[PDB]
Amino acid sequence: GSAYQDYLARSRVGEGLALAASARLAVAENAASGNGFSGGYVSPPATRNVDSIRVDDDSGQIVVAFTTRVAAAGANTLVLVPSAPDQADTPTARVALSKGAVQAGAITWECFADGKASSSLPAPGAGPLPTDAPTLAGKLAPPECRA
């Protein structure tokens, strides 16, 4: 809407992504120990900015769902995608996380908003795409989430 309304919404999206850091933490810790990526993790209680944060147990992808005070229903999600290198010295490509593998290489997170149709990850290569299409408008998301 108005410039102030977008400014307010962007600040709230930023707060919601800080909340989701605990899910990205859980995924990375589970990757290091070879456990399912949502193991030990439960979404925080709803806030007035974030309806839910969910973690896929097999890919580690995270869906952050914002409330209607941030964006409309069906237009309110960001997706955070983790990936690992094929090898952690001069890497060749990027792969989705593998349940049960002990992940030595560091895990890279890529954010996706609506309209980001492809990964922007640099060398060693493109990362995986969101399984569930994110629907939050790019102008409400941080720049790294946008197309």
The CATH number that applies at residue 35 is 3.30.700.10
On whether the CB atoms of residues 97 and 81 are closer than 8 A, the answer is no
Strand partners, 80: 62, 111
3-state class of 33 per DSSP?
A: helix
Q: What total of structural domains would you count in the chain?
A: 1
Residue ranges making up the domain that contains 53? 3-145
What is the residue-wise DSSP string for 70-127?
Answer: TS-TTS-EEEEEEEEESSSSS---EEE--TT----SPPEEEEE-TT--S----TT-PP
Experimental technique for the deposited model: X-ray
Token pair for residue 132? Answer: 């569930």
Resolution rounded to one decimal, in angstroms: 1.5
